Coordinates of C-alpha atoms in Angstrom, one line a residue:
Chain A
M1 CA 55.0 198.9 73.9
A2 CA 57.3 196.4 75.7
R3 CA 57.9 192.9 74.6
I4 CA 55.9 190.3 76.5
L5 CA 57.8 187.8 78.5
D6 CA 55.1 185.2 78.5
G7 CA 56.2 182.5 80.9
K8 CA 53.3 180.2 80.0
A9 CA 54.4 180.0 76.4
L10 CA 58.0 179.6 77.3
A11 CA 57.2 176.8 79.8
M12 CA 55.5 175.0 76.9
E13 CA 58.6 175.3 74.8
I14 CA 60.7 174.1 77.7
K15 CA 58.4 171.2 78.5
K16 CA 58.5 170.1 74.8
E17 CA 62.3 170.1 74.9
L18 CA 62.4 168.2 78.2
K19 CA 60.0 165.5 76.7
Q20 CA 62.6 164.9 74.0
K21 CA 65.6 165.0 76.2
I22 CA 64.1 162.6 78.8
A23 CA 63.2 160.1 76.1
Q24 CA 66.7 160.2 74.7
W25 CA 68.2 159.5 78.1
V26 CA 65.7 156.8 78.9
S27 CA 66.7 155.2 75.6
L28 CA 70.3 154.8 76.8
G29 CA 69.0 152.3 79.3
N30 CA 67.6 154.4 82.1
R31 CA 64.3 154.4 84.0
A32 CA 62.2 157.5 83.6
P33 CA 62.6 160.0 86.4
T34 CA 60.2 159.6 89.3
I35 CA 58.9 162.3 91.7
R36 CA 56.9 161.9 94.9
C37 CA 55.0 165.0 96.1
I38 CA 54.0 164.9 99.8
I39 CA 50.7 166.9 100.5
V40 CA 49.9 167.6 104.2
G41 CA 46.3 168.7 104.6
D42 CA 43.4 169.7 102.4
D43 CA 44.2 173.3 101.4
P44 CA 42.4 173.6 98.0
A45 CA 45.2 175.8 96.6
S46 CA 48.0 173.4 97.6
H47 CA 46.1 170.6 95.7
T48 CA 45.8 172.7 92.6
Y49 CA 49.5 173.3 92.7
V50 CA 50.3 169.6 93.1
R51 CA 48.0 168.7 90.3
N52 CA 49.8 171.1 88.0
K53 CA 53.1 169.5 88.8
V54 CA 51.6 166.0 88.1
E55 CA 50.1 167.2 84.8
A56 CA 53.5 168.6 83.7
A57 CA 55.2 165.3 84.8
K58 CA 52.8 163.3 82.6
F59 CA 53.5 165.7 79.7
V60 CA 57.3 165.3 79.8
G61 CA 57.5 161.6 80.7
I62 CA 58.2 161.9 84.4
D63 CA 56.3 159.4 86.7
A64 CA 54.7 161.4 89.5
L65 CA 52.9 160.1 92.6
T66 CA 51.2 162.2 95.2
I67 CA 51.3 161.1 98.9
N68 CA 48.5 162.7 100.8
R69 CA 48.8 163.1 104.6
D70 CA 46.4 164.7 107.1
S71 CA 46.8 168.1 108.7
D72 CA 47.4 166.4 112.1
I73 CA 50.4 164.4 111.0
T74 CA 53.3 164.8 113.5
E75 CA 56.7 166.1 112.6
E76 CA 58.1 162.7 113.5
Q77 CA 55.7 161.0 111.1
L78 CA 56.5 163.4 108.2
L79 CA 60.3 163.0 108.7
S80 CA 59.8 159.2 108.9
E81 CA 58.1 159.1 105.5
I82 CA 60.7 161.3 104.0
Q83 CA 63.5 159.1 105.2
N84 CA 61.7 156.1 103.7
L85 CA 61.6 157.9 100.4
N86 CA 65.2 158.8 100.8
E87 CA 66.1 155.1 101.0
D88 CA 63.8 154.0 98.1
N89 CA 66.0 153.6 95.0
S90 CA 62.8 153.7 92.9
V91 CA 62.3 157.4 93.9
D92 CA 64.5 160.0 92.2
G93 CA 62.9 163.2 93.5
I94 CA 61.0 164.2 96.7
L95 CA 59.0 167.4 97.1
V96 CA 57.0 168.6 100.1
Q97 CA 54.2 171.0 99.2
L98 CA 55.0 174.2 101.1
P99 CA 52.1 175.1 103.3
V100 CA 53.0 172.7 106.1
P101 CA 51.2 173.2 109.6
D102 CA 52.7 175.4 112.3
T103 CA 53.3 172.2 114.3
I104 CA 56.1 171.2 112.0
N105 CA 59.4 173.0 111.7
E106 CA 59.8 173.7 108.0
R107 CA 63.6 174.0 108.3
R108 CA 63.8 170.4 109.7
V109 CA 61.6 169.2 106.8
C110 CA 63.8 170.8 104.1
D111 CA 66.9 169.4 105.6
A112 CA 65.5 165.8 106.0
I113 CA 65.2 165.4 102.2
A114 CA 68.3 163.7 100.8
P115 CA 70.1 166.5 98.9
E116 CA 70.5 164.3 95.9
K117 CA 66.6 164.0 95.7
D118 CA 65.8 167.6 96.8
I119 CA 63.9 168.8 93.8
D120 CA 63.0 172.1 95.4
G121 CA 66.7 172.8 96.2
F122 CA 65.9 174.0 99.7
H123 CA 68.3 171.7 101.6
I124 CA 71.1 173.7 103.2
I125 CA 73.7 171.7 101.3
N126 CA 72.0 172.6 98.0
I127 CA 71.6 176.2 99.0
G128 CA 75.3 176.2 100.1
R129 CA 76.4 175.0 96.8
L130 CA 74.3 177.6 95.0
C131 CA 75.9 180.4 97.1
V132 CA 79.5 179.4 96.4
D133 CA 78.5 179.3 92.7
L134 CA 78.9 175.5 92.4
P135 CA 76.7 173.0 90.4
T136 CA 73.6 172.1 92.5
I137 CA 69.9 171.7 92.5
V138 CA 68.6 175.3 92.2
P139 CA 65.2 176.5 93.6
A140 CA 62.7 176.3 90.8
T141 CA 61.2 179.8 90.8
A142 CA 64.6 181.4 90.9
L143 CA 65.7 179.1 88.0
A144 CA 62.5 180.1 86.2
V145 CA 63.4 183.8 86.4
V146 CA 66.9 183.1 85.2
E147 CA 65.6 181.0 82.3
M148 CA 63.2 183.8 81.3
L149 CA 66.1 186.2 81.0
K150 CA 68.3 183.7 79.0
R151 CA 65.5 182.6 76.7
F152 CA 64.5 186.2 75.8
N153 CA 68.1 187.3 75.2
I154 CA 68.0 189.8 78.1
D155 CA 71.5 191.1 78.7
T156 CA 72.7 190.6 82.2
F157 CA 76.5 190.7 81.9
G158 CA 77.7 194.0 83.5
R159 CA 74.1 195.3 83.6
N160 CA 72.4 196.8 86.7
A161 CA 69.8 194.4 88.2
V162 CA 67.6 195.2 91.1
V163 CA 65.9 192.4 93.0
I164 CA 63.1 193.5 95.3
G165 CA 62.8 190.8 97.9
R166 CA 65.3 188.9 99.9
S167 CA 63.3 185.7 100.8
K168 CA 65.5 182.7 101.3
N169 CA 63.4 180.5 99.0
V170 CA 63.0 183.0 96.1
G171 CA 64.6 186.5 96.3
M172 CA 68.0 185.4 97.6
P173 CA 68.5 182.6 95.1
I174 CA 67.5 185.0 92.3
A175 CA 70.0 187.6 93.4
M176 CA 72.7 184.9 93.9
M177 CA 72.3 183.6 90.3
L178 CA 72.1 187.0 88.7
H179 CA 75.6 187.8 90.0
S180 CA 77.0 184.4 89.3
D181 CA 80.3 184.2 87.5
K182 CA 79.9 182.2 84.3
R183 CA 83.4 180.8 84.4
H184 CA 82.7 178.9 87.7
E185 CA 81.9 175.2 87.6
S186 CA 78.2 176.0 88.2
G187 CA 77.9 177.7 84.8
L188 CA 74.7 179.5 85.8
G189 CA 76.7 182.7 85.4
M190 CA 74.9 185.9 84.6
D191 CA 77.5 188.4 85.9
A192 CA 75.0 191.3 86.6
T193 CA 75.6 194.0 89.2
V194 CA 72.9 193.2 91.6
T195 CA 71.2 195.4 94.2
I196 CA 69.1 193.6 96.9
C197 CA 66.3 195.8 98.0
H198 CA 63.8 194.6 100.7
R199 CA 61.2 195.6 103.2
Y200 CA 63.4 198.1 105.0
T201 CA 64.8 199.9 101.9
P202 CA 63.5 203.5 102.0
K203 CA 61.0 204.3 99.3
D204 CA 63.1 207.1 97.8
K205 CA 66.2 204.9 97.7
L206 CA 64.3 202.1 96.1
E207 CA 63.0 204.4 93.4
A208 CA 66.5 205.7 92.7
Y209 CA 67.9 202.2 92.3
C210 CA 65.0 201.2 90.0
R211 CA 65.5 204.3 87.8
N212 CA 69.0 203.2 87.2
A213 CA 68.3 199.5 86.7
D214 CA 68.4 197.6 83.4
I215 CA 66.5 194.8 85.0
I216 CA 64.0 194.8 87.9
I217 CA 62.8 191.6 89.5
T218 CA 60.0 191.9 92.0
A219 CA 60.1 188.8 94.2
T220 CA 58.8 190.1 97.5
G221 CA 55.5 188.9 99.2
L222 CA 54.9 192.4 100.6
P223 CA 53.0 194.9 98.4
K224 CA 55.3 196.9 96.2
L225 CA 54.4 199.0 93.2
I226 CA 56.6 199.5 90.2
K227 CA 55.4 202.8 88.6
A228 CA 56.4 204.2 85.2
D229 CA 58.5 206.9 86.8
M230 CA 60.6 204.2 88.4
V231 CA 61.5 202.5 85.1
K232 CA 64.5 203.2 82.9
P233 CA 63.4 203.3 79.3
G234 CA 64.0 199.9 77.7
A235 CA 64.4 198.1 81.0
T236 CA 63.3 194.6 81.7
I237 CA 60.6 194.1 84.4
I238 CA 59.8 190.6 85.7
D239 CA 57.0 190.2 88.3
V240 CA 57.6 186.9 90.1
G241 CA 54.0 186.9 91.3
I242 CA 54.6 186.4 95.0
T243 CA 51.9 188.0 97.1
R244 CA 44.9 186.4 97.1
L245 CA 47.7 186.8 94.6
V246 CA 48.3 190.2 93.0
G247 CA 50.6 192.0 90.6
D248 CA 53.4 194.3 91.6
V249 CA 53.6 196.5 88.4
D250 CA 51.5 199.3 87.0
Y251 CA 51.3 197.3 83.8
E252 CA 49.5 199.7 81.6
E253 CA 51.8 202.6 82.2
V254 CA 55.1 200.6 82.7
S255 CA 54.4 198.7 79.5
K256 CA 54.8 202.1 77.7
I257 CA 58.3 202.5 79.2
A258 CA 59.9 199.1 79.6
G259 CA 61.7 197.2 76.9
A260 CA 60.3 193.8 78.1
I261 CA 57.7 192.9 80.8
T262 CA 55.9 190.0 82.3
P263 CA 52.2 190.0 81.2
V264 CA 49.3 189.7 83.7
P265 CA 49.3 186.9 84.7
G266 CA 53.0 186.4 84.1
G267 CA 53.2 182.6 83.7
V268 CA 55.9 182.4 86.4
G269 CA 53.9 179.6 87.9
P270 CA 54.0 177.4 84.8
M271 CA 57.7 178.3 84.4
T272 CA 58.3 177.2 88.0
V273 CA 56.6 173.9 87.4
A274 CA 58.7 173.3 84.2
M275 CA 61.8 174.0 86.2
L276 CA 60.7 171.5 88.8
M277 CA 60.6 169.0 86.0
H278 CA 64.1 170.1 84.8
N279 CA 65.3 169.5 88.4
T280 CA 63.8 166.0 88.6
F281 CA 65.4 165.0 85.3
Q282 CA 68.7 166.6 86.5
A283 CA 68.5 164.6 89.8
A284 CA 67.7 161.3 88.0
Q285 CA 70.7 161.8 85.7
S286 CA 73.1 162.5 88.6
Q287 CA 71.9 159.5 90.6
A288 CA 72.4 157.2 87.5
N289 CA 75.9 158.6 87.0
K290 CA 77.0 158.1 90.6
Chain B
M1 CA 89.3 214.1 108.3
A2 CA 87.8 210.6 108.5
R3 CA 87.4 208.9 111.8
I4 CA 90.1 206.1 111.8
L5 CA 88.5 202.8 112.8
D6 CA 91.3 201.2 114.8
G7 CA 90.8 197.5 114.2
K8 CA 94.0 196.6 116.1
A9 CA 92.7 198.2 119.2
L10 CA 89.2 196.8 118.8
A11 CA 90.7 193.3 118.3
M12 CA 92.6 193.6 121.5
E13 CA 89.4 194.6 123.3
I14 CA 87.7 191.5 121.9
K15 CA 90.7 189.2 122.7
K16 CA 90.7 190.4 126.3
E17 CA 87.0 189.6 126.6
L18 CA 87.6 186.1 125.0
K19 CA 90.5 185.4 127.4
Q20 CA 88.1 186.0 130.4
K21 CA 85.2 184.0 128.9
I22 CA 87.4 181.1 127.9
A23 CA 89.0 180.9 131.4
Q24 CA 85.5 181.0 133.1
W25 CA 84.3 178.2 130.7
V26 CA 87.5 176.1 131.4
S27 CA 87.0 176.5 135.1
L28 CA 83.6 174.7 134.9
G29 CA 85.4 171.5 134.0
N30 CA 86.3 171.9 130.4
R31 CA 89.6 171.6 128.4
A32 CA 90.9 174.8 126.8
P33 CA 89.9 175.0 123.1
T34 CA 92.5 173.5 120.7
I35 CA 93.2 174.4 117.1
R36 CA 95.4 172.7 114.5
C37 CA 96.5 174.8 111.5
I38 CA 97.7 173.0 108.4
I39 CA 100.1 174.8 106.1
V40 CA 101.4 173.4 102.8
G41 CA 104.6 175.0 101.4
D42 CA 106.5 178.1 102.4
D43 CA 105.8 181.8 102.3
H44 CA 103.3 181.3 107.5
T45 CA 103.2 184.9 108.8
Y46 CA 99.4 184.8 109.1
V47 CA 99.8 181.6 111.1
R48 CA 102.3 183.3 113.4
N49 CA 99.6 185.9 114.0
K50 CA 96.9 183.2 114.6
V51 CA 99.2 181.3 117.0
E52 CA 100.1 184.5 118.9
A53 CA 96.4 185.4 119.4
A54 CA 95.6 181.9 120.5
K55 CA 98.3 181.9 123.1
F56 CA 97.0 185.3 124.3
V57 CA 93.4 184.2 124.8
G58 CA 94.1 180.7 126.2
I59 CA 93.6 178.6 123.1
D60 CA 96.1 175.8 122.5
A61 CA 97.4 175.9 118.9
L62 CA 99.7 173.6 117.0
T63 CA 100.8 174.1 113.4
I64 CA 101.2 171.1 111.1
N65 CA 103.7 171.9 108.3
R66 CA 103.6 169.8 105.1
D67 CA 105.8 170.1 102.1
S68 CA 104.3 171.6 98.9
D69 CA 104.2 168.3 97.0
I70 CA 101.7 166.5 99.2
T71 CA 98.9 164.9 97.3
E72 CA 95.1 165.4 97.9
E73 CA 94.6 162.0 99.4
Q74 CA 97.4 162.7 101.9
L75 CA 96.0 166.1 102.9
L76 CA 92.5 164.6 103.1
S77 CA 93.8 161.7 105.3
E78 CA 95.5 164.2 107.5
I79 CA 92.2 166.1 107.9
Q80 CA 90.3 162.8 108.6
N81 CA 92.6 161.9 111.4
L82 CA 92.1 165.3 112.9
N83 CA 88.3 164.9 112.6
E84 CA 88.4 161.7 114.7
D85 CA 90.9 163.1 117.2
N86 CA 88.9 164.0 120.3
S87 CA 91.7 166.2 121.5
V88 CA 91.3 168.6 118.5
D89 CA 88.4 171.0 118.6
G90 CA 89.2 173.1 115.5
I91 CA 90.9 172.5 112.2
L92 CA 92.1 175.1 109.6
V93 CA 93.9 174.6 106.3
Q94 CA 95.9 177.7 105.5
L95 CA 94.7 178.5 102.0
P96 CA 96.4 179.1 99.4
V97 CA 96.8 175.4 98.6
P98 CA 98.4 174.1 95.3
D99 CA 96.3 173.9 92.2
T100 CA 96.5 170.1 92.2
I101 CA 94.5 170.4 95.5
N102 CA 90.8 170.9 94.9
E103 CA 89.8 173.5 97.5
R104 CA 86.1 172.5 97.6
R105 CA 86.9 168.9 98.4
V106 CA 89.3 170.0 101.2
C107 CA 86.8 172.4 102.7
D108 CA 84.1 169.7 102.8
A109 CA 86.6 167.2 104.3
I110 CA 86.8 169.1 107.6
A111 CA 84.1 168.1 110.0
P112 CA 81.6 171.0 110.1
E113 CA 81.7 171.0 113.9
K114 CA 85.5 171.6 113.8
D115 CA 85.5 173.9 110.7
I116 CA 86.8 177.1 112.3
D117 CA 87.0 179.0 109.0
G118 CA 83.3 178.3 108.3
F119 CA 84.1 177.2 104.7
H120 CA 82.3 173.8 104.9
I121 CA 79.3 173.8 102.6
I122 CA 77.1 173.0 105.5
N123 CA 78.3 176.0 107.5
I124 CA 78.0 178.2 104.4
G125 CA 74.5 176.9 103.7
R126 CA 73.3 177.7 107.2
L127 CA 74.8 181.2 106.9
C128 CA 72.8 181.8 103.7
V129 CA 69.5 180.9 105.2
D130 CA 70.2 183.0 108.4
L131 CA 70.7 180.1 110.8
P132 CA 73.4 180.2 113.5
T133 CA 76.6 178.8 112.1
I134 CA 80.3 179.1 112.1
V135 CA 80.7 182.4 110.2
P136 CA 83.8 183.0 108.0
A137 CA 86.1 185.0 110.2
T138 CA 86.8 188.0 107.9
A139 CA 83.1 188.5 107.2
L140 CA 82.3 188.2 110.9
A141 CA 85.0 190.7 111.6
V142 CA 83.5 193.3 109.2
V143 CA 80.0 192.8 110.7
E144 CA 81.4 193.1 114.3
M145 CA 83.4 196.3 113.3
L146 CA 80.2 197.9 111.9
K147 CA 78.4 197.1 115.2
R148 CA 81.2 198.0 117.6
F149 CA 82.0 201.3 115.8
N150 CA 78.3 202.2 115.7
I151 CA 78.0 202.4 111.9
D152 CA 74.3 202.5 111.1
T153 CA 73.2 199.9 108.6
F154 CA 69.4 199.8 108.8
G155 CA 68.0 200.8 105.4
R156 CA 71.3 202.3 104.4
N157 CA 72.9 202.1 100.9
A158 CA 75.8 199.7 101.0
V159 CA 78.2 198.5 98.3
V160 CA 80.2 195.3 98.6
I161 CA 83.0 195.0 96.0
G162 CA 84.0 191.4 95.4
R163 CA 82.1 188.1 95.2
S164 CA 84.6 185.8 96.7
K165 CA 83.1 182.7 98.3
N166 CA 85.1 183.1 101.5
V167 CA 84.8 186.9 102.1
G168 CA 82.8 189.0 99.6
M169 CA 79.8 186.7 99.5
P170 CA 79.2 186.2 103.2
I171 CA 79.7 189.9 103.9
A172 CA 77.0 190.8 101.4
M173 CA 74.8 188.0 102.7
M174 CA 74.9 189.2 106.3
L175 CA 74.8 192.9 105.4
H176 CA 71.5 192.7 103.6
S177 CA 69.7 190.1 105.7
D178 CA 67.0 190.3 108.3
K179 CA 68.2 190.7 111.9
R180 CA 64.9 189.2 113.1
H181 CA 66.0 185.8 111.7
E182 CA 67.5 183.1 114.0
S183 CA 71.2 184.0 113.4
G184 CA 70.6 187.6 114.5
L185 CA 73.6 188.7 112.3
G186 CA 71.6 190.4 109.5
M187 CA 72.2 194.1 109.2
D188 CA 69.1 195.1 107.0
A189 CA 71.1 197.3 104.6
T190 CA 70.4 197.6 101.0
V191 CA 73.3 196.0 99.3
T192 CA 74.8 196.3 95.8
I193 CA 77.3 193.7 94.8
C194 CA 79.9 195.0 92.4
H195 CA 82.6 192.8 90.9
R196 CA 85.2 192.5 88.2
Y197 CA 82.8 192.8 85.3
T198 CA 80.9 195.8 86.7
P199 CA 81.7 198.5 84.1
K200 CA 83.8 201.3 85.5
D201 CA 81.2 204.0 85.1
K202 CA 78.5 202.0 86.9
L203 CA 81.0 201.0 89.7
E204 CA 81.7 204.7 90.4
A205 CA 78.0 205.6 90.3
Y206 CA 77.1 202.9 92.9
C207 CA 80.1 203.9 95.1
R208 CA 79.1 207.6 95.0
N209 CA 75.6 206.6 96.1
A210 CA 76.7 204.5 99.0
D211 CA 76.7 205.2 102.8
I212 CA 78.9 202.2 103.3
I213 CA 81.6 200.7 101.0
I214 CA 83.1 197.3 101.9
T215 CA 85.8 196.4 99.4
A216 CA 87.4 192.9 99.3
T217 CA 89.0 192.6 95.8
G218 CA 92.7 192.9 96.3
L219 CA 93.0 195.7 93.7
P220 CA 95.1 198.6 95.1
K221 CA 93.8 202.1 94.5
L222 CA 90.4 200.8 93.3
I223 CA 88.5 203.3 95.5
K224 CA 89.3 206.9 94.7
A225 CA 88.2 210.1 96.4
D226 CA 85.9 211.1 93.6
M227 CA 84.0 207.8 94.1
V228 CA 83.1 208.3 97.8
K229 CA 80.0 210.0 99.2
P230 CA 80.9 212.7 101.8
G231 CA 80.6 211.1 105.2
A232 CA 80.5 207.5 104.0
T233 CA 82.0 204.6 106.0
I234 CA 84.8 202.8 104.1
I235 CA 85.8 199.3 105.2
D236 CA 88.9 198.1 103.4
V237 CA 89.2 194.3 103.4
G238 CA 91.9 194.0 100.7
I239 CA 95.5 193.3 101.5
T240 CA 98.0 193.5 98.6
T241 CA 101.9 193.5 98.7
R242 CA 103.3 196.3 96.6
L243 CA 100.6 195.8 102.5
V244 CA 98.0 198.1 101.0
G245 CA 94.2 197.8 100.7
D246 CA 91.8 198.6 97.8
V247 CA 91.4 202.2 98.9
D248 CA 93.4 205.3 98.1
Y249 CA 93.9 205.8 101.8
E250 CA 95.3 209.4 102.2
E251 CA 92.9 210.9 99.6
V252 CA 89.8 209.0 100.6
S253 CA 90.4 210.0 104.2
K254 CA 89.6 213.6 103.3
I255 CA 86.1 212.7 102.2
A256 CA 84.9 209.6 104.1
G257 CA 83.4 209.9 107.5
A258 CA 85.1 206.8 108.7
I259 CA 87.8 204.5 107.3
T260 CA 89.7 201.4 108.2
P261 CA 93.5 201.6 107.7
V262 CA 95.6 198.8 106.1
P263 CA 97.4 197.5 108.0
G264 CA 95.7 197.7 111.4
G265 CA 92.1 197.5 110.4
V266 CA 90.2 194.4 109.4
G267 CA 93.3 192.1 109.6
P268 CA 93.6 191.9 113.4
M269 CA 89.9 191.6 113.6
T270 CA 89.9 188.6 111.3
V271 CA 92.3 186.8 113.7
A272 CA 90.2 187.7 116.7
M273 CA 87.2 186.3 115.0
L274 CA 89.1 183.1 114.3
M275 CA 89.6 182.8 118.1
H276 CA 85.9 183.6 118.6
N277 CA 85.0 180.7 116.2
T278 CA 87.4 178.3 118.0
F279 CA 85.8 179.0 121.3
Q280 CA 82.3 178.6 119.7
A281 CA 83.2 175.2 118.3
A282 CA 84.7 173.9 121.5
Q283 CA 81.6 175.0 123.4
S284 CA 79.3 173.3 120.9
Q285 CA 81.2 170.1 121.0
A286 CA 81.2 170.0 124.8
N287 CA 77.4 170.7 124.9
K288 CA 76.6 168.0 122.3

């Protein structure tokens, strides 16, 4: 039976450490980190997600405030509120909850947030720094996956890693970090040999890559199935949980083969929220330094 | 034997197209695109090649020579003046620059609109989210060679050797990405990125499994005949002085279906794509 990579319990460990580190930094003469989460509409799932971010902020000592807007807000109104938060020195981090209406161009929204306050790390400047393997604000779900590997002592250096999914918000940043060079200034250097599989990878080729992989990360929103015959004995399987939501792994059979595996549910959600808190603390420190 | 992918001849074909499209654009009331290349120290030959292709296609190029003991602030003040110079459409710094010079700061000092090399973090960030951008020229050369030589990429197994921020990373980015996205440069291949810490056994296994190998490490004789799948396409981006590439050329040519030689392969295509990028930037600035 594989070791369980329980992201919920790890997130608790991380949130406890963050609580202490934030208090120490505040005690040097700093204001506690602040985050503003913009919510557009009344999607009940988007409100659950924002409440989770707020509850974790309270736990670690970050001051969070939710700004609710109506589904009919115009793009010009949303960008106007972001630019106001950009210029407000009492705000360290800005998030936009990511089901925004079809009226609004998501790309313009991501790039309107000041990079220094872009807790989601989706601004092109932050993505650019990630991809040249430079210190930046890294997207939280990708950072969560990387943190699960590091905290569970999963060997990446020179190992074969397959990432199933190339999404710009999740799959691409995961692959980029997995093949980072440790020596570079970024320091998020895992040095794995990474194969990026995606919606057009043929089934038989995907299975061959998976059979030779030491690590498989399923990040795609399209239905994939990792079966036991795709898994190298002792390999590490992380299901990111992108998808209402479903699981991408034949857990019962793959657990008999894999060396380490995400449970069902995987806790990647709680890990993502903990990494958002990490990013808010990181941003607050950078701004205080500059 | 392998099909020899004649990059010199393809580059000439592209440069003749550019010459015509630039002249047509100029005739609408526009000034010819201008480029300033900054070189620090001695060796320049690359810059001779850049300036020769610029003259061929109708781009006005000037080279700015600086002695090797220039400081960062001086180099950055030189770039700033060129940013504000409305007669200059494109700026390049001939890297390598001395170690006292921080490359990242210099890359981000060029105005993104004039950054012909595509190394500004804004241009790189747009590349990585599949937006139209100024694409690094060697990476764009590789993608254009795959298209013009009709090398199938959709769902194919590809290996990129090398992670360099200027070459290896953008190649792997475009090669695996979705062509439906706004940039339209994605090639929808399955891509394995191998690098200096890939163990030798696993490197050879990925190479033997690949339909396309793109190597940009600068390690001569890295790719051997027993590492190549029969019929595979071999794109050799490396250029080392012993000018050789990363591939054992005469032996791999017996197994591969298609191969780029060194010299005469990616090199001339890089220069042609630099001219493509200069024309692109001049058009964007006139339209803005």
